[PDB]
Amino acid sequence: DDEEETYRLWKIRKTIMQLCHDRGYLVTQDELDQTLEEFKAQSGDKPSEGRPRRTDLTVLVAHNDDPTDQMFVFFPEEPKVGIKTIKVYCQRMQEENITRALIVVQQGMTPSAKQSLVDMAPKYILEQFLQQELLINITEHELVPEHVVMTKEEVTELLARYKLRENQLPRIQAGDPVARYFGIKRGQVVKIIRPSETAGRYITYRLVQ
């Protein structure tokens, strides 16, 4: 039963793997072209294997520049996750010495756990999700254009072109979905490429607070 749930696991795997690819971490094409049938071959079944760690990934090193920087992905099985589970995953991180970990939860988190997610370890970052939001990769959506993360040298180049200061740019709040998606630390610039009615693309720059 719960064939939909198995497809949900397939889809969340697909999308997180794709997201890690776009973010620049270690992802390979043979992984990205996996099918639902092959995943069924790889995985077990919803009533047989359950929600705990079966096919989650931590291979996501910073393949772009320095593999020492690495992503965890965790799949806690309980619906609501509390502070003790935070401690368990915290010691998991600390003993593994992995810098980053994406967290997905089933039915939300306890207020104490929600509180800890802002100050647990300034040396670590623990972006949080629910499977709800990862059933679709928002970049595939029509209503949202393409983004690019922009680099300090080009920051200087642009604000030289117009003779501005960075407080004179438009804004994008950190909590915004794509901001969460690329996990951008505040104080950076993102290039927005607005499609137009013609070949002329509309380029525009937006600063994250």
Tokens standing for 4? Answer: 């939909």
Per-residue interface string for the shown chain with other proteins, residues 158-177, x marking contact by CB under 8 A = ----xxx--xxxx-xx--xx
Q: What are phi and psi of 133, to 5 degrees?
A: -80, -20
Residue 102 β-bridge partners? 73
Is residue 4 involved in binding other proteins (CB under 8 A)? yes
- Give me the half-sphere count of Cα atoms (radius 13 Å) on the Cβ side of residue 15: 20
Nearer to other proteins, 86 or 169 (CB): 169
Is residue 142 involved in binding other proteins (CB under 8 A)? yes
Nearer to other proteins, 102 or 169 (CB): 169
CB of 87 to other proteins, least distance (A): 30
Is residue 187 involved in binding other proteins (CB under 8 A)? no
Kindly determine how many residues on this chain lie close enough to bind other proteins according to the rule CB under 8 A: 35
Using the rule CB under 8 A, give the single segment among 31-39, 56-64, 113-121, 137-145 that binds other proteins: 137-145
Cα distances from 179 to residues 36, 127, 185, in angstroms, run: 29, 11, 9
Per-residue interface string for the shown chain with other proteins, residues 96-135, x marking contact by CB under 8 A = ------------------------------------xx-x
CB of 93 to other proteins, least distance (A): 29
**One-letter amino acid of 68:** T
Gapped junctions in the chain, after residues (C–N > 2.5 Å): none
Is residue 155 involved in binding other proteins (CB under 8 A)? no
SS3 128: strand
SS3 46: helix
**What's the N-to-C CA distance of the chain in angstroms?**
45
Beta strands in 75-124 (DSSP E): 100-105
Is residue 148 involved in binding other proteins (CB under 8 A)? no
Query: What residue spans of 121-207 are helical by DSSP H?
Result: 152-162, 177-182
**Residues between 22 and 81 that touch other proteins (CB under 8 A):** none
Which residues contact other proteins by CB under 8 A?
4, 7, 132-133, 135-136, 138, 140-145, 162-164, 167-170, 172-173, 176-179, 192, 196, 198-200, 202, 204-206
